[PDB]
Amino acid sequence: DIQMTQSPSSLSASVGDRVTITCQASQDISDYLIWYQQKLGKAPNLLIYDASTLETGVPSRFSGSGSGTEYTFTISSLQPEDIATYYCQQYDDLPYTFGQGTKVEIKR
C-alpha cells in the first residue's frame, strides 16, 4: 500500500563519475528505507538501512540521504564493480514494497 517511485530506470556514466538515484514514498516512512545492489544473476545485497546507515564492509563511496518521503542514493565515484541494479525498499509497513530499480552501467 505504500508506493515507491524510483528514478531513473537506467543510466550510463563513466568510471569516476557521480551517480544520483532517488526514491519518493507515497507517505512518510519514518526513515525506514533500505538500498540494495543486485548484480546480474544474484540476490539483492543490503548496502544501507535506516535510509542513511551503511552496513559493514560497504565502500564509503556509497551513501544515502533523505527524510520523510524523498530519499536519494549517491555513488560518489563509479567503479566497474558497481554495475548492477539498485533498488530502494521501505520496511515501515507490510507489505514491504520496492521501487522499480535503477540499472547502472559504465559507458565506454
Swiss-Prot record:
Q: Classify the main location.
A: secreted
Q: Which residues form the Ig-like domain?
A: 2-95
Indicate where this protein resides in the cell.
Secreted; Cell membrane
Q: Region (Complementarity-determining-3) spans which residues?
A: 89-95
User: Which residue ranges are recorded for the region named Complementarity-determining-1?
Assistant: 24-34
MF terms in GO: antigen binding; identical protein binding
Cellular component per GO?
blood microparticle; extracellular region; immunoglobulin complex; plasma membrane
Annotated region (Framework-2), positions in chain: 35-49
Q: Could you tell me which residues belong to the region Complementarity-determining-2?
A: 50-56
Where is the segment annotated Framework-1?
1-23
Give UniProt keywords alphabetically: Adaptive immunity, Bence-Jones protein, Cell membrane, Disulfide bond, Immunity, Immunoglobulin, Immunoglobulin domain, Membrane, Secreted, Signal
Enumerate the Gene Ontology biological process terms. adaptive immune response; immune response
Ranges for region Framework-3 = 57-88
SS bond list: C23-C88
Q: Subunit details for this protein? A: Immunoglobulins are composed of two identical heavy chains and two identical light chains; disulfide-linked.
Described by its record, this protein's role is as follows:
V region of the variable domain of immunoglobulin light chains that participates in the antigen recognition. Immunoglobulins, also known as antibodies, are membrane-bound or secreted glycoproteins produced by B lymphocytes. In the recognition phase of humoral immunity, the membrane-bound immunoglobulins serve as receptors which, upon binding of a specific antigen, trigger the clonal expansion and differentiation of B lymphocytes into immunoglobulins-secreting plasma cells.
Protein's name according to its UniProt entry: Immunoglobulin kappa variable 1-33
| Species of origin | Homo sapiens (Human)
Task: State the gene name recorded for this protein.
Answer: IGKV1-33
Which part of the complete protein is shown? 23 to 117 of 117
